[PDB]
Amino acid sequence: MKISEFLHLALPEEQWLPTISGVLRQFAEEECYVYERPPCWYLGKGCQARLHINADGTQATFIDDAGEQKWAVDSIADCARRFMAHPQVKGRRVYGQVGFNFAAHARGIAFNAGEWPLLTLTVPREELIFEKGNVTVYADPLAVDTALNGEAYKQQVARAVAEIRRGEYVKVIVSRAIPLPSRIDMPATLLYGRQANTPVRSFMFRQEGREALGFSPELVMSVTGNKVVTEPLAGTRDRMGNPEHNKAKEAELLHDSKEVLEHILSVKEAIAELEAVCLPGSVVVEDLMSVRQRGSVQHLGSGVSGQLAENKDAWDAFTVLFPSITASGIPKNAALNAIMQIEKTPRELYSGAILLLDDTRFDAALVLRSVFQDSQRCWIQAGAGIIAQSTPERELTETREKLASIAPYLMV
Amino acid sequence: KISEFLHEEQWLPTISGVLRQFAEEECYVYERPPCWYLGKGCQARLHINADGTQATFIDDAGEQKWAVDSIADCARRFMAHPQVKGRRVYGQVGFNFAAHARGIAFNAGEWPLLTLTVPREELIFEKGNVTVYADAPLAVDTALNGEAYKQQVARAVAEIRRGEYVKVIVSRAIPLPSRIDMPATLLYGRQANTPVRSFMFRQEGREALGFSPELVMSVTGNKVVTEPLAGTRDRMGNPEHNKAKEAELLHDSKEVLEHILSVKEAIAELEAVCLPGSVVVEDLMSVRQRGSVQHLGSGVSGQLAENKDAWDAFTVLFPSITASGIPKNAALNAIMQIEKTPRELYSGAILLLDDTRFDAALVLRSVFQDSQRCWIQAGAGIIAQSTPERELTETREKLASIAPYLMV
Numbered sequence: 001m002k003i004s005e006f007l008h009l010a011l012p013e014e015q016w017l018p019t020i021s022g023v024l025r026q027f028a029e030e031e032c033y034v035y036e037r038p039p040c041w042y043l044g045k046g047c048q049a050r051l052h053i054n055a056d057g058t059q060a061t062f063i064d065d066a067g068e069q070k071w072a073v074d075s076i077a078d079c080a081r082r083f084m085a086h087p088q089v090k091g092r093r094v095y096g097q098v099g100f101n102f103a104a105h106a107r108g109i110a111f112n113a114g115e116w117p118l119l120t121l122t123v124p125r126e127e128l129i130f131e132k133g134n135v136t137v138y139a140d141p142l143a144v145d146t147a148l149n150g151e152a153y154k155q156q157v158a159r160a161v162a163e164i165r166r167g168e169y170v171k172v173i174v175s176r177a178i179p180l181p182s183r184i185d186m187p188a189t190l191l192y193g194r195q196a197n198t199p200v201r202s203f204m205f206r207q208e209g210r211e212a213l214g215f216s217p218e219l220v221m222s223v224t225g226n227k228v229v230t231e232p233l234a235g236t237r238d239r240m241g242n243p244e245h246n247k248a249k250e251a252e253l254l255h256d257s258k259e260v261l262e263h264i265l266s267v268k269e270a271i272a273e274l275e276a277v278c279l280p281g282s283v284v285v286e287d288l289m290s291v292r293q294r295g296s297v298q299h300l301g302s303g304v305s306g307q308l309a310e311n312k313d314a315w316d317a318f319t320v321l322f323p324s325i326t327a328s329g330i331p332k333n334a335a336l337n338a339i340m341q342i343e344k345t346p347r348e349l350y351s352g353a354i355l356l357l358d359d360t361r362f363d364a365a366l367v368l369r370s371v372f373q374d375s376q377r378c379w380i381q382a383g384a385g386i387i388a389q390s391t392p393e394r395e396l397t398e399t400r401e402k403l404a405s406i407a408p409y410l411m412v
Numbered sequence: 413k414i415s416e417f418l419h420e421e422q423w424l425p426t427i428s429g430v431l432r433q434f435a436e437e438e439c440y441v442y443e444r445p446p447c448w449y450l451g452k453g454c455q456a457r458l459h460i461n462a463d464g465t466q467a468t469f470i471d472d473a474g475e476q477k478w479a480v481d482s483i484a485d486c487a488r489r490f491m492a493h494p495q496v497k498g499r500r501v502y503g504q505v506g507f508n509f510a511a512h513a514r515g516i517a518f519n520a521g522e523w524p525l526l527t528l529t530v531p532r533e534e535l536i537f538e539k540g541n542v543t544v545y546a547d548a549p550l551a552v553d554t555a556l557n558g559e560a561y562k563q564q565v566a567r568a569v570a571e572i573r574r575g576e577y578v579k580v581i582v583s584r585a586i587p588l589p590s591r592i593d594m595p596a597t598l599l600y601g602r603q604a605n606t607p608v609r610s611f612m613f614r615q616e617g618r619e620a621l622g623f624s625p626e627l628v629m630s631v632t633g634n635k636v637v638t639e640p641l642a643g644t645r646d647r648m649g650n651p652e653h654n655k656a657k658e659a660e661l662l663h664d665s666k667e668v669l670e671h672i673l674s675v676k677e678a679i680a681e682l683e684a685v686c687l688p689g690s691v692v693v694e695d696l697m698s699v700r701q702r703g704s705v706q707h708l709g710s711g712v713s714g715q716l717a718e719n720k721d722a723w724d725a726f727t728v729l730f731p732s733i734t735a736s737g738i739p740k741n742a743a744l745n746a747i748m749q750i751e752k753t754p755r756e757l758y759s760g761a762i763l764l765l766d767d768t769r770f771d772a773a774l775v776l777r778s779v780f781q782d783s784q785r786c787w788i789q790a791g792a793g794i795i796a797q798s799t800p801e802r803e804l805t806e807t808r809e810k811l812a813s814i815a816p817y818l819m820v
């Protein structure tokens with residue numbers, strides 16, 4: 001039983017995000033969740049009920065006010081379904097994070113565990129929903145050098161290009177972590193970062209000593225009723241200039257054969273993924289290869305949709321779609337294998353998903369253009385789609401173009 | 413009126429037989445799985461002459477001249493005519509229809525811009541039955557004159573790289589040593605192909621036959637579909653060869669780019685005539701087997717707007733982007749400067765209109781003959797990245813879909 005209150009803040013638009021970050025500052029050190037899905041910002045505080053999957057997928061724990069329960073881990077998706085069905089959870093927004101290694105675990109691909117949970121789902125104790133200067137309450141500058149270690153990355157890209165030329169796989173996203181000098185101030189980074197971006201969703205969370213914040217450029221998946229959508233963005237140029245340099249870069253992208261190829265190969269794989277969980281004949285491209293503006297960078301983007309088959313649910317669709325093809329590679333299983341052989345730090349949540357599940361929707365945003373901090377590390381991370389035609393130098397520059405989406409706006 | 417219903421392997425042979433038995437008679441043959449249609453004679457017809465200056469309507473009662481300010485409106489008038497309404501109509505649309513509909517100036521050829529015919533008799537071949545309704549291979553050298561075509565391609569590449577337009581189909585006509593036996597060529601060529609539609613028409617001393625690899629348009633009720641194919645490799649080797657060429661096609665950046673450029677234009681074309689938000693890609697860039705060649709193919713669909721009919725959709729979609737170019741009007745003008753023989757029906761459409769459809773097949777992989785010329789024709793979509801030698805070879809791969817099956 002939660003009490004609710006509605007407040008009209010007589011606030012100008014300019015003050016809406018400043019007010020949201022100011023609330024977040026008041027949350028201090030408490031566990032919390034922030035999700036932007038226009039026209040709303042959803043803020044959760046504390047933990048009423050949580051599902052926790054540990055880093056190697058061997059232990060599932062359900063926690064609520066009756067205590068901890070261990071659940072069987074025969075399928076993480078079944079644990080998720082059990083969570084969502086629970087009396088503590090039905091009819092409440094659930095805030096979730098899914099780590100990169102959830103994929104290897106679901107697919108029976110051996111992997112070296114990182115430190116972060118594979119999956120968590122949380123119902124918060126308190127919530128604030130901001131919309132157009134109204135609020136509903138439910139209650140009971142860093143300098144970072146993105147050029148550094150750029151040499152070792154070019155080598156990783158070389159290896160990938162060489163492995164693609166040998167036929168091992170067709171596309172792989174190779175990424176790099178940039179260790180940061182200190183922990184960051186989440187509220188301020190959210191404020192400055194967000195105004196410098198135009199993401200499909202924004203998020204921030206703090207849970208069990210781990211935090212992340214980011215400006216998600218695309219959906220892994222959205223399900224509303226029986227309709228499932230995925231939004232592959234792939235093929236990039238900067239937009240770090242005048243409207244003229246940007247338009248020239250847009251033009252240079254829409255017609256560059258290499259980028260078009262990398263885009264369309266990814267879209268075809270997304271179609272194939274949806275066809276696995278959808279009614280025959282229902283999978284269509286609703287928007288084909290249009291340019292999407294994302295702060296420092298612009299990308300070719302497509303929207304693909306289908307109707308879920310009678311025997312499939314949103315967790316089946318999620319398991320197939322995860323991680324985004326555009327953040328992993330083609331064929332997906334081969335690219336996942338390659339990422340674990342080429343990359344030398346755990347991705348953790350990078351290239352994973354942030355979830356908001358509610359009455360009408362299962363919403364899953366791709367974790368890119370994000371910052372991560374825990375007891376051991378504080379970092380940003382960005383990657384690039386590598387294909388046969390890729391060259392190490394362009395791909396290093398491309399990772400810098402993407403890092404410029406967040407790195408300038410990291411605040412202490 | 414059904415007259416006879418007499419109970420597949422014998423269908424082609426029978427069609428050939430009609431064509432032979434009743435030569436000197438106008439005949440229209442159309443394949444749309446699971447049926448073949450054959451029309452004979454002429455109960456009513458609309459004829460648009462080669463420069464689009466005269467529309468003639470003919471029925472039994474005689475001949476009429478109709479106002480020809482809009483060819484589409486003439487076609488609509490024919491379709492609502494009391495002698496036509498409720499009957500299947502067999503049609504053809506020449507390349508220069510587009511120029512005319514678009515108010516682009518053109519040099520007229522010899523063939524009609526548009527004909528629509530209601531036959532006097534019809535045979536329908538469906539599920540082991542025919543239903544009757546009533547009131548030597550010639551050797552062709554496809555290498556000859558390739559140097560002239562390569563200069564044509566080089567000129568288009570030059571114009572594209574100057575920014576004059578993005579894509580154009582440059583084609584070449586191959587004059588044949590003799591007239592061909594249409595019904596035998598139909599039989600022999602059909603067996604060697606897997607087209608989306610087949611046709612053979614004979615009308616007013618002109619004949620054309622072919623194995624259409626894609627639809628310009630199909631309208632069924634309010635749903636409009638178009639089927640751009642673009643991006644080609646041979647399928648003329650062993651299955652190992654052919655599967656390797658299919659994989660090479662799916663990953664060749666030049667082919668994928670020329671394909672997606674075309675698909676995006678087809679989307680834009682459908683958006684011009686469909687309900688906002690209804691236009692989708694039902695099939696994105698899958699390989700389509702077409703005899704000597706395999707192609708990247710997409711299927712694009714939409715719901716017609718309340719104020720648009722199938723003729724509005726046809727005039728936007730014609731000729732196929734994949735047989736003309738991008739932007740379409742600029743490409744049409746380029747074709748008219750670059751090519752030196754009239755396309756006539758090449759890159760045009762064959763139509764079948766009935767109770768449950770407006771179907772329009774793209775005219776490629778076809779042979780043509782009249783009182784003056786006997787020829788086959790094939791082209792290639794040229795973009796900034798094209799190589800004249802490759803495009804020449806591609807035309808020869810395409811021509812191999814019909815040239816080996818030309819029967820005298």
Ligand SMILES: [Mg+2]
Binds near residue numbers: 385398
């Ligand atoms: Mg890229």
Ligand SMILES: [Mg+2]
Binds near residue numbers: 642643644792793806
């Ligand atoms: Mg081609």
